[PDB]
Amino acid sequence: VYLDRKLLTLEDKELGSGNFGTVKKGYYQMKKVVKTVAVKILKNEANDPALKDELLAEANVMQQLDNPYIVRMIGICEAESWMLVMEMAELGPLNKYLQQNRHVKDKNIIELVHQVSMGMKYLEESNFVHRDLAARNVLLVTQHYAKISDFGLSKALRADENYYKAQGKWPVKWYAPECINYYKFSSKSDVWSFGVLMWEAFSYGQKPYRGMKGSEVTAMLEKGERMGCPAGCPREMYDLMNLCWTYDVENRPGFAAVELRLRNYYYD
Ligand SMILES: Cc1ccc(-c2cc3nccnc3c(NCCCCN)n2)cc1
């Protein structure tokens, strides 16, 4: 079903944007209380069939997810444009937050990346691949509560395979070698991305592989080289990043193992 446009009120505040259109702050009338929302709105009155199809696929994935560490969809609305209404994570993207808050303690960063690993362990159990995991796609509810967002590239895995074979966005810097070379996306390739996300978080929102072309990143990784340890990053956390960047898909850990490593380190 669809949300009632008359129960949605959009504010002038823009939270984000991209090729699809914009994301605006708003409020939606629930069964009794009013709820603060973020609303993804397609540009050009949803003229583009591709953007429409993509928004519905994004909604389809989110409808099936229910986890505390993943952004919740309230619903979809077909009105002046097509709109995807979500619970708002009011501190915004993790990368931008850390850029602006260098005082955040290492224990706090560990806490947040552990939360991301819990959301991803759930996604893995649910057999969905995210395909766009990155620090810009983790939103903060509070400084101690992270949620995974941006499910526009996510896929439900077939019952008989543990990967999706791509037939758009190509965030090479977050992609595992098998994604680049064989177009195969699995929970293991999400683990590689999570390694990059960890590097970003401990680098207070710095972009990875800075100054390098995609082709140069691919060549670097092919010859067994990896990004260095961020300043002040605990060695155990850098060791985990390197494990996430295991070239061999089979030998690379899954999220159950990654989450457990983070869980144990966080609790000493
Ligand atoms: C200062 C600030 C900036 C952005 C947001 C915000 C919150 C959101 N909550 C739920 C869903 N989407 C959201 C969103 N989308 C746009 C940014 C996409 C990043 N990958 N932004 C909040 C505060």
Which of 132, 150, 160, 239 is flagged as catalytic? 132
**Atom 2 (ligand 1): residue with closest C-alpha?**
92
Alpha-carbon distance of 11 to 29, in angstroms, equals 14
3-state secondary structure labels for all residues of 52-78: HHHHHHHHHHHHCCCCCCECCEEEEEE
Domain 89-268 grouped into CATH 1.20.1250.20: no
**Measured from the CA of 16, which atom of ligand 1 is nearest?**
16
3-state secondary structure of 251: coil
CA of 20 to the centre of ligand 1 (A): 15
Residue burial 208-240, b: 16+ Cβ < 10 Å; e: rest: bbeeeeeeebbeebeeeeebebbeebbeebbeb
| Binding site residue list | 15-23, 40
Active site residue 160: no
Domains of the chain, residue spans = 1-88, 89-268
CATH topology of domain 1-88: Phosphorylase Kinase; domain 1 (3.30.200)
Which residues have C-beta atoms less than 6 Å from ligand 1?
A: 15-16, 23, 38, 71, 86, 88-93, 136-137, 139, 149-150
Give the method used.
X-ray
Q: Report in angstroms the alpha-carbon separations of 131 from 72, 149, 185, 195.
A: 18, 11, 7, 13
Alpha-carbon distance of 23 to 20, in angstroms, equals 9
β-partners of residue 39 are 24, 85
Check if the beta carbon of residue 113 is closer than 8 Å to that of residue 135. Answer: no
